[PDB]
Design a protein around this ligand. Structure first.
Ligand SMILES: *[C@@H]1O[C@H](CO)[C@@H](O[C@@H]2O[C@H](CO)[C@@H](O[C@@H]3O[C@H](CO)[C@@H](O)[C@H](O)[C@@H]3O)[C@H](O)[C@H]2NC(C)=O)[C@H](O)[C@H]1NC(C)=O
Ligand SMILES: *[C@@H]1O[C@H](CO)[C@@H](O[C@@H]2O[C@H](CO)[C@@H](O[C@@H]3O[C@H](CO)[C@@H](O)[C@H](O)[C@@H]3O)[C@H](O)[C@H]2NC(C)=O)[C@H](O)[C@H]1NC(C)=O
Ligand SMILES: *[C@@H]1O[C@H](CO)[C@@H](O[C@@H]2O[C@H](CO)[C@@H](O[C@@H]3O[C@H](CO)[C@@H](O)[C@H](O)[C@@H]3O)[C@H](O)[C@H]2NC(C)=O)[C@H](O)[C@H]1NC(C)=O
Ligand SMILES: *[C@@H]1O[C@H](CO)[C@@H](O[C@@H]2O[C@H](CO)[C@@H](O)[C@H](O)[C@H]2NC(C)=O)[C@H](O)[C@H]1NC(C)=O
Ligand SMILES: *[C@@H]1O[C@H](CO)[C@@H](O[C@@H]2O[C@H](CO)[C@@H](O)[C@H](O)[C@H]2NC(C)=O)[C@H](O)[C@H]1NC(C)=O
Ligand SMILES: *[C@@H]1O[C@H](CO)[C@@H](O[C@@H]2O[C@H](CO)[C@@H](O)[C@H](O)[C@H]2NC(C)=O)[C@H](O)[C@H]1NC(C)=O
Ligand SMILES: *[C@@H]1O[C@H](CO)[C@@H](O[C@@H]2O[C@H](CO)[C@@H](O)[C@H](O)[C@H]2NC(C)=O)[C@H](O)[C@H]1NC(C)=O
Ligand SMILES: *[C@@H]1O[C@H](CO)[C@@H](O[C@@H]2O[C@H](CO)[C@@H](O)[C@H](O)[C@H]2NC(C)=O)[C@H](O)[C@H]1NC(C)=O
Ligand SMILES: *[C@@H]1O[C@H](CO)[C@@H](O[C@@H]2O[C@H](CO)[C@@H](O)[C@H](O)[C@H]2NC(C)=O)[C@H](O)[C@H]1NC(C)=O
Ligand SMILES: *[C@@H]1O[C@H](CO)[C@@H](O)[C@H](O)[C@H]1NC(C)=O
Ligand SMILES: *[C@@H]1O[C@H](CO)[C@@H](O)[C@H](O)[C@H]1NC(C)=O
Ligand SMILES: *[C@@H]1O[C@H](CO)[C@@H](O)[C@H](O)[C@H]1NC(C)=O
Ligand SMILES: *[C@@H]1O[C@H](CO)[C@@H](O)[C@H](O)[C@H]1NC(C)=O
Ligand SMILES: *[C@@H]1O[C@H](CO)[C@@H](O)[C@H](O)[C@H]1NC(C)=O
Ligand SMILES: *[C@@H]1O[C@H](CO)[C@@H](O)[C@H](O)[C@H]1NC(C)=O
Ligand SMILES: *[C@@H]1O[C@H](CO)[C@@H](O)[C@H](O)[C@H]1NC(C)=O
Ligand SMILES: *[C@@H]1O[C@H](CO)[C@@H](O)[C@H](O)[C@H]1NC(C)=O
Ligand SMILES: *[C@@H]1O[C@H](CO)[C@@H](O)[C@H](O)[C@H]1NC(C)=O
Ligand SMILES: *[C@@H]1O[C@H](CO)[C@@H](O)[C@H](O)[C@H]1NC(C)=O
Ligand SMILES: *[C@@H]1O[C@H](CO)[C@@H](O)[C@H](O)[C@H]1NC(C)=O
Ligand SMILES: *[C@@H]1O[C@H](CO)[C@@H](O)[C@H](O)[C@H]1NC(C)=O
Lengths: 523, 523, 523
C-alpha cells in the first residue's frame, strides 16, 4: 500500500545521477593566512571588483544524426552526407539506408519523410524522429557539448569524445587542434540549417561555418565560432564599494568590511590593455563607474586611474582609489588665515582618526582567516558523509554530489512527474527478515513515461536509486520522514500516520530559545 | 566485577528517555542573508529589545484520581464523584469501591482512610496512596499537563489526551473548545481543595473554578484560569544597548556590535496599544528605560518615542532612539559667533566621522550571516550523529535528543541514585563471542529503589538503556572512558586501571599550542 | 601488479604509530563567554604579550648500555660499570660478559672492540654496536626521555620508566625525588664522555654531574642539569600590538582586533619579581620594548610601567599601556589662549570619538566567543571520526591522532623510503569474496631496510597499518585515490588509469563559484 507525496517548488522531486565520473571536484587546503605586521595607518580607500579564473567548460550546441535498425538489437548507423544535407535543408529524411538495402517495416518506397518531435525528449538531447514508434528509423538529436581550456577536444552530453577544437575553422590548425580522422571531417561555409527539425515548414538560417564529423554510429555537427568572442577566461566574482588597502614594501593588501576574505598582491600592476582582459575590461570599468556614480559622486573624488592587480591566490582585481573631499567642501555641500588654520587642524584630526578606524577595520577583516580555514577543514571532513549538503551550503545553491574516495563527483538531477510519487507503508525488507530500510521506498514515474520505477525517498524531495539503504530492525522504532509539505510517521517500520509540519518546531540558531520537554517519572 | 563511579554536579548520572515522540524538533534553512546595497551613512542609534514568538506549550498542574484493583492485573477505575469531594475536602478516601463491591484485603469496613505520601513519587507525578503497599487501593496523582496554542486540548504528563481547552470556564465555549463527553464534565465554582493530600490536617484553599472530567480509568481535575492572564505569546530574547539602524525606502535594518544577527523589518510600525503586546509591553518599556538610566541618562537624550516593529523573521522589536548631546554640552558636563561657528564645525566633523564608523559597524555586523548559515548546515549534518551534543552547543544548556529520521526528539532525564553506578570490568560480550561493547556496561539503581538495572555508560555521566552499542573486537585495544572525575582504562576490552584526569591534556582552541609526542624508532 | 607513488615535501610517505597510550589529549568545554555589561568608553590602549602554562614534558637525552646474548632468544643484560667507564672514556667495549663466561662466536680473546654506528638507527635511539651483524654483542643507544612536572620520574623513548627526578643531583633529595634502588644509582662529578661513540677517536667532553642507574637489562645514564636553568613553566603564545582594555570594579578585560579571543583578569597584579617569571621576564619585556620601538616610538608615549596579570583562564599577560601624544605634538611632527582652547576642543572631540571606536572594537571582539564555543563542540564531535584532521586544523600543523574512547592519543610518524611505495591494482579482498578494501593496498619499505611491508594507503601520503579497512563490494564502483601529485582511478575495485590532478577542480570556499555538470536525459 501507498501514500501520496506533495509538491514543492525549489526542491522538486528529482533523481540525481553522477555525470559518468567526469565532473570531479575535491577539497584542498587552499586558504592561507598571512598576518600583516605593521600598524601603519595611512591606508588607501577605494572601490574594488574581483574576477576569478574561469574553470567552467565552454558549452555549445551540437547535432547528432543517426539511423536505427531493429531486427531489439538496435544498431545505430551514420546517415549519408547527402541525407544530412536533406535533413538540414528540408527538415526531411529519406526512408531507406544502404550499405544491402533496408526500409521501414514492409515497405520499399524510399520516399521522403517529415521529421517530427520526439515528445520523450528533454531540455537536453531534444530529439526528432521520422517514425514515432517509441524496422528502420531516422533520428536527429540536438544536445549540449562541453570543452575545457585548452579547447582541444570536447565531450558531448551523450558521452562521445571528439578530438577536435570547437573553434577549428579550417584555417587555424596552428592555433587549434584536430585529431580525428581527416577523411571524415567537413567544414561548410554559409551552411543553411532549419530552425526546428520538427516543423513541416521552418525559417531557414545561414551559419558562417558549420563542421561535420562522420562517427562510426553517428554524424556530429557543430557551428564553429570565434574563441575570443565566445569564451572568457575570467568570471566576475564580487564588487566591494568600501574597500581599504594597506601598502607594504612589495605588497598591496585589500580588505572589505562586508567580506570575510582579504586579498594580497604585489605592487606591480597588470597591463590593463592586455588581450586576456578584453572580455572583462569594459564590464569591470563600468561596474566601477556605476559604484562611483551611485555612491561617491558627491562626497568623494577619484584618486588615480583604474589599476589592475593579480592576487597571490590568482584573482584579478580592478581598483579605483577614492579620496573624500575636504571638510570645507563637505560642509558647503551640506549647507581668514586663522580660519584656514582652524580648518587645517580639523582636517588633520579627522584624517588621523579616520586612519585609526581604517587600521582597525583591516585588522577585523584579517581576523576571519583562521576561522575560515578551520571551517574549510570541517567542510572537508563532513563532505565524506553528505557531500551534496556541504557543497550546497558552500555554494548557496542546490548541489548534488557523490563520494568517490578522495574526490567528489557532481551529479545532475532529472525532474520526475512530481505527482506519481507513492511512498510505501512497510519499511521492513520482506526479501530479507531482520533487515529494514533506512528511508521509505517510493514508487515514481519519469516524465512522459508510464513504467513504474522503485526508488528510495531522500532528503529535499530527492529520489534515490541503486542499492537501497538498509539497517538492523532495532525495535521499538519511531521515525518521521519529510517529503514536500508533509511528514510520515513509521512505527516499528510500518506507516502510522501523517504529521502536521506545524507540530514540529524548527531549530533557531540565531535566537536559541529552548522549550522544556515532558518530564519523566521513573517508569 | 565492578568499579565505582564518582559524582558530578551539572551533569549528574541520569537516564534520558524520549518523550513518547511528542517533543519533536527539526533543522530548517531559516537563515536568510540580504546584503544592504546603499552606503548611506546617516544611521540612527538607539536601544533595542527583541522578543520571540512563544512556541513552548503552556504547562499547568492537574490531579488524577484513581482506584486500583489487584487480583497483578492492576485494573484502574474512576472513583465516584462524592469520593472525589471527600478526597478534596478531607484529604481522605473511602475503603470501598462498588460497580458488585470490593474492599481492602480481607475486610468489609468501608471505613475512611487517610491519604499519605507515596515516597516513590518524583518532582513530577507526586503521588498519594491510602495503603502503602508498593486487594484495593486509592490513589491521587498531582502532575503536569501541556497545551500548545491554540489551547483546544492538553496532554498530561501521563500521556492522556483531553479534548478540552484549559481555559474553558463554562461560559466561553464560543472562544474556547470542548470536545469531550458532556455528561462527564463538571465545573465547580469556589471549589475547596486541601493544600497537601498527604497531611492529616492541611490548610484548605478555595479555587475560583475547578473542572473535573470522568475518564474511563480516572478522574482528571484542573484549575481553570484566565488565558490572557496566564499565557504570553512573546518571550523576551535579548536587549541590545548599542544598536544602529539603517533606513531604506521600505525597510529598517537593525544591527548590534555584540550580536552576530541583524534584523530587517518594514518601516510601518506595530500598534503598541495592541492586545497581543499586553503581557510584554510594560516589561519591554521598563527594560528600555533601565538601559537608558544606567547608560545614556547623562551623555544622550531620547529621540522620539518607543517604536514597535515586526521583523521579517517574526521577531518583535521595541526601539528607543537615542541622540548624543552636542559636544558643547558634553564638554560642559566633563568640565561669540566665531566660537559658535568653531563648535558647529567641530560637531560637523564629529558627526561625519561617527556616521562613517556606524556604517563600518553595520557592514561588520552583516558579515556574519553567511558564516552563520554555513554553520547551521554543519549543525544539521552533525545532528544525525549526535543530536544531543549539537543541540546542547546551540542552546548552551544540557539537552538530550534522539534521531528520528528527518526530525529530532527531545528527551527528559531522570537522575539516578548517583552512588549505585558500578562499571563492569569486562567489555567483551560474553553472550556472543567476537562482539564487544563500544562503551562499558554499568549497574545502577533508580532513586528510592533497589532493583539493580543494567545499562551502558554514556558521555557526560549519562546512562544509556535499550540495545547496547556493540562492535567488532579489534584486538589489540586500548580505550579510556571518563565518568565523573575519573577515567577507566580498558586494554583488550578488559579493565586495566584508573587514570588521573590531570595526566590527560585538554585541547585549547583559543591558544592552540601543541606538545610533541614520543618519537618512534622503526620498530 | 603495482603502480608507483610520487614524492611530496610537507606530507612525506610515513607510518604514524600511537605513543603506547601515553600522549593522551581530550576535548573539554573550556570556552566560557562572559558578556561585559557597561558601555563605559574610557578604555585603555596598550601592548600585550600572552604566555601559556607549559604543559609539555621536559625532554633530555639519555644513554642506554646493554649487552645482547643470542643462542633468537636475545637476552639483554647490563654491562658492568667498569665496562661502562671504558665505553664512556675510550668509546670501546670489551669482548666478553661474565655472570659463567661468554664471548663472540667461536672466540676467547676478551679483546677490546671499537664501537661503530648502527646504520639502522634513526634520529631517535641512535645506536652503536661492536659487531655489525644486523653470539654476544655490545650496544649503546642514545635516545630521548620525557618528564612532566613535577619532574619526579621520567619515561625514556624505549618505554622504560625510572622513578628518579632528572634534576636530583645527590644533594637535593628534599627538593627532588629518588625512588629507585639506592644500591644501583651512582652520580659522578666531572664525568668525561666522548662526543661520538662511533668514532675511533673523538673529542672528549666533561659533564658536571652524570647519573647512572643499573636496570635489570640495561644501564641508563643521563646528565643532571639545573631545573630552573633548563625548564620554563610558561610558553610564549602571542603578542598583540593594538590591545584595548576595559576596567570594571574588579576586572580588567583585554581585547585585540586581530584576535578572536578576549582575556579577563582581576585588577590585582602579579609580582613581576617572582621566581616563576624568571625564564620569561626579560623576553617579555624586550618583546614589549620592541613593539614600542617599531610601532609607537614617535606617535605614542608609555603610560605606566609593565603590569603582569593572571587571566581567569590561566594565561599570563604582560601589559604596557600606551597613550597617543596630543594632537598639537602629532601635527608638529607631521609638519594664544583662544588657540589653546581650540586645540583643547579638538582634543576633546578626538578623544570622545576614539573612545566610541574603542568601545565598538571591544564589542566586536566579544562577539566571537559564542561562535568559537560552538565550533569547539563541532570539533569535538568530528574528532571521533577523524581526530588527526581535526587536531591538524586546530593546531595548524600535521598532527596524527587516534581515537581512544573519550580521549585521543597523539601519534608519531616514521618516514619510509618514499620510493618503495607500490599501490596494488586490485582492491578486492581475494581472501574473502564479497568484501573489498576501502582504500588501496600499498607495498612499502622502511628506510635502510629491505623486508617488503604491506599496508593501506591513507590520506596526505600516510601509510596505514594493522587491520585493513574493508566494506561491501557495492558494484558498480568508481573511486579516485590521491597520493603524491597523482590520482588513481579504480573501477569495480580494479585499477583503471591515472588521472591528472589538473582535471579535478578544487573547492573554493572564499569565492564559491560553481560550474554546472553535464545534464542528464532520462536514461
Ligand atoms: C533513395 O532516393 C534517393 C534520391 O531520391 C537516393 O539518394 C541518392 O543516393 C546516391 C548514393 O546512393 C547519391 O549519390 C552521391 O552523391 C554525392 C554528391 O551529391 C556523392 O558525393 C556520393 O559519392 C554519391 O555519388 C545521390 O546524390 C542521392 N540523391 C540525391 C541526394 O538527390 C538514394 O540512393 C535512394 N536509396 C535507395 C535505397 O534507393
Ligand atoms: C461506604 O460509605 C459511604 C458513606 O459512608 C457510601 O457513600 C455513599 O454512596 C452513595 C452511592 O452509593 C452516595 O449517593 C450518591 O449521592 C450523590 C449526591 O451526593 C448522587 O449524585 C449520586 O447519584 C448517589 O446517589 C452517597 O452520597 C454516599 N455518601 C456520602 C457521600 O456521604 C458508600 O456507598 C459506601 N460504600 C459501600 C460499598 O458500602
Ligand atoms: C676481560 O678483561 C678485562 C680487563 O682487561 C677484565 O675487566 C676486569 O674485570 C674485573 C671484574 O671481573 C674488574 O674488577 C672490578 O673492579 C672494580 C673497581 O675498578 C670493582 O668495583 C669491582 O667490584 C671489581 O673488582 C676489573 O676492574 C676489570 N679490569 C679493568 C676495568 O681494567 C674482565 O674481567 C675480563 N673478562 C673476562 C671474561 O676475562
Ligand atoms: C579562423 O580563426 C582564426 C583564429 O584562430 C581567425 O584569425 C583571426 O582573424 C581575425 C579577423 O581577421 C583577426 O583579427 C585575428 O588577428 C586573427 N587571429 C589569428 C590568430 O589568426 C580567422 O580569421 C578565422 N577564419 C575564418 C575563415 O573565419
Ligand atoms: C601594455 O600592452 C599594450 C598592448 O596591449 C602596449 O601597447 C603597445 O605600446 C607600444 C609602445 O607605445 C606600441 O608600439 C604598440 O603598438 C602598442 N601595442 C598596441 C597593441 O597598442 C603597452 O605599451 C603595454 N604597456 C607596458 C607598460 O608594457
Ligand atoms: C470566562 O472566560 C471568558 C473569556 O473567555 C471571560 O470573559 C472575559 O471577562 C472579562 C472580565 O469580565 C472581560 O474583561 C473580557 O472582555 C471577557 N472576554 C470575553 C471574550 O468574554 C469570562 O468573564 C469568564 N467567566 C467567568 C465566570 O470567569
Ligand atoms: C491602536 O489600537 C488602539 C486600541 O488598541 C486604538 O485606540 C482606539 O482609538 C480610537 C480612535 O481614537 C478610539 O475610538 C478607540 O476607543 C480606541 N480604542 C481603545 C481600546 O482605546 C488606536 O487608535 C490604534 N491606532 C491606530 C493608528 O490604528
Ligand atoms: C643541586 O641542586 C640544588 C637545587 O635543587 C642546588 O641548590 C641551589 O644552588 C644554587 C647555587 O648555589 C643556589 O643559588 C640555590 O639557591 C640553591 N637552591 C636550593 C633549593 O638548594 C645545588 O647547588 C645543586 N648542587 C650541586 C652540587 O650542583
Ligand atoms: C615581590 O617579590 C619580591 C621578591 O621576589 C619582593 O622583594 C622583597 O622586598 C622586601 C621589602 O623591600 C625585601 O626585604 C626583600 O629582600 C625583597 N626580596 C628580594 C628577593 O629582593 C617584593 O617586595 C615583592 N612585592 C610585593 C608587593 O610583595
Ligand atoms: C559566406 O557568406 C559571406 C557573406 O555573403 C561571403 O562573404 C563569403 O564569401 C561566403 N563564403 C565563401 C566561402 O565564399
Ligand atoms: C558614471 O558617470 C560618468 C560621468 O560622470 C559616466 O561617464 C559613466 O558612464 C557613468 N557610469 C554608469 C552610468 O554606469
Ligand atoms: C591617469 O590617466 C591619465 C590619462 O587619462 C594620465 O594623464 C595620468 O598620468 C594617469 N595617472 C597617473 C597617476 O599617472
Ligand atoms: C504525471 O502523473 C499524472 C498522475 O498520474 C498523470 O496524469 C500524467 O499523465 C503524468 N504525466 C506524464 C507521465 O508526463
Ligand atoms: C464564588 O465566590 C465569589 C467570592 O465570594 C462570589 O462572588 C461568587 O458569586 C461565587 N460563585 C458563585 C457561583 O456564586
Ligand atoms: C528611569 O528613569 C525614569 C525617570 O528619569 C523613570 O521614570 C523610569 O522608571 C526609570 N527606569 C527604571 C528605573 O528602570
Ligand atoms: C511622542 O509622544 C508624545 C506624547 O507622549 C507625542 O506628543 C509626540 O508627538 C510623539 N512623537 C512623535 C514623533 O510624534
Ligand atoms: C542510594 O545508594 C546508596 C548506596 O548504595 C544507598 O545507601 C541509598 O539508600 C540509595 N538511595 C535510594 C535507593 O534512594
Ligand atoms: C668538578 O670540576 C670543578 C671544576 O674543576 C671543580 O670545582 C669541582 O670541585 C669538581 N668536582 C668535585 C667533586 O671536586
Ligand atoms: C627599544 O628602545 C629602547 C630605548 O628607547 C631600548 O632600551 C630597548 O632595548 C629597545 N628594544 C629593542 C631594541 O628591542
Ligand atoms: C613606575 O616605575 C618607576 C620606577 O621605574 C616608579 O617610580 C613609578 O612610580 C612607577 N609607576 C607607578 C604608576 O607607580
Ligand atoms: C629506497 O628505495 C630505493 C628504490 O628501491 C632503493 O634503491 C634504496 O636503496 C632504498 N633505500 C633504503 C632502503 O634505505
Amino acid at each position: 500500500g501507498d501514500v501520496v507525496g506533495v509538491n514543492t517548488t525549489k526542491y522538486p522531486y528529482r533523481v540525481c545521477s553522477m555525470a559518468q565520473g567526469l565532473d570531479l571536484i575535491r577539497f584542498e587546503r587552499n586558504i592561507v593566512c598571512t598576518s600583516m605586521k605593521p600598524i601603519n595607518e595611512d591606508l588607501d580607500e577605494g572601490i574594488m571588483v574581483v574576477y576569478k579564473r574561469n574553470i567552467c567548460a565552454h558549452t555549445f550546441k551540437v547535432r547528432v544524426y543517426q539511423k536505427v535498425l531493429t531486427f531489439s538489437n538496435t544498431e545505430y548507423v551514420a546517415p549519408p552526407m547527402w541525407e544530412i544535407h536533406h535533413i538540414n535543408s528540408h527538415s526531411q529524411c529519406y526512408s531507406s539506408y544502404s550499405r544491402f538495402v533496408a526500409y521501414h517495416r514492409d515497405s520499399y518506397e524510399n520516399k521522403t519523410m517529415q521529421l517530427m518531435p520526439d515528445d520523450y525528449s528533454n531540455t537536453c538531447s531534444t530529439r526528432y524522429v521520422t517514425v514515432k514508434d517509441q524496422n528502420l528509423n531516422c533520428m536527429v538529436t540536438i544536445t549540449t557539448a562541453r570543452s575545457k581550456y585548452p579547447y582541444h577536444f570536447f565531450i558531448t552530453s551523450t558521452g562521445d569524445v571528439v578530438d577536435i577544437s570547437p573553434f577549428y575553422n579550417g584555417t587555424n590548425r596552428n592555433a587549434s587542434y584536430f585529431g580525428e580522422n581527416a577523411d571524415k571531417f567537413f567544414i561548410f561555409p554559409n551552411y543553411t540549417i532549419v530552425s526546428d527539425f520538427g516543423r513541416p515548414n521552418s525559417a531557414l538560417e545561414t551559419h558562417r561555418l558549420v563542421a561535420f564529423l562522420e562517427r562510426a554510429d553517428s554524424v556530429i555537427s557543430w557551428d564553429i565560432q570565434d574563441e575570443k568572442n565566445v569564451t572568457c577566461q575570467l568570471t566576475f566574482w564580487e564588487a566591494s564599494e568600501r574597500t581599504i588597502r594597506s601598502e607594504a614594501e612589495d605588497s598591496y593588501h585589500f580588505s572589505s568590511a562586508k567580506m570575510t576574505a582579504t586579498f594580497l598582491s604585489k605592487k606591480q600592476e597588470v597591463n590593463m590593455s592586455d588581450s586576456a582582459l578584453d572580455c572583462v575590461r569594459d564590464e569591470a570599468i563600468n561596474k566601477l563607474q556605476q559604484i562611483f556614480n551611485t555612491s561617491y559622486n558627491q562626497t568623494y573624488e577619484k584618486y588615480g586611474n583604474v589599476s589592475v592587480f593579480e592576487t597571490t591566490g590568482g584573482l584579478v582585481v580592478f581598483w579605483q582609489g577614492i579620496k573624500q573631499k575636504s571638510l570645507v567642501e563637505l560642509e558647503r555641500l551640506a549647507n581668514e588665515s586663522v580660519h584656514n588654520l582652524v580648518y587645517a587642524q580639523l582636517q588633520f584630526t579627522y584624517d588621523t582618526l579616520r586612519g585609526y578606524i581604517n587600521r582597525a577595520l583591516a585588522q577585523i577583516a584579517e581576523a576571519w582567516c583562521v576561522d575560515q580555514r578551520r571551517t574549510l577543514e570541517v567542510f572537508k571532513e563532513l563532505s565524506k558523509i553528505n557531500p551534496s549538503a556541504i557543497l550546497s551550503a558552500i555554494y548557496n545553491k542546490p548541489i548534488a554530489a557523490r563520494f568517490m574516495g578522495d574526490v567528489l563527483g557532481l551529479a545532475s538531477c532529472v525532474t520526475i512527474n512530481q505527482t506519481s510519487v507513492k511512498v510505501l507503508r512497510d519499511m521492513n525488507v520482506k526479501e530479507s527478515p531482520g533487515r529494514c530500510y533506512s528511508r521509505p521506498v517510493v514508487i515514481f514515474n519519469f516524465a512522459n513515461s508510464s513504467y513504474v520505477q522503485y526508488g528510495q525517498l531522500g532528503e529535499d524531495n530527492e529520489i534515490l536509486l541503486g542499492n537501497h539503504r538498509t539497517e538492523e530492525c532495532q525495535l521499538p522504532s519511531l521515525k518521521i520522514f519529510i517529503a514536500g509539505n508533509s511528514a510520515y510517521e513509521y512505527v516499528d517500520y510500518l506507516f502510522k500516520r501523517m504529521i502536521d509540519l506545524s507540530s514540529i518546531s524548527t531549530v533557531d540558531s540565531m535566537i536559541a530559545l529552548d522549550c522544556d520537554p515532558l518530564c519523566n517519572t521513573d517508569f
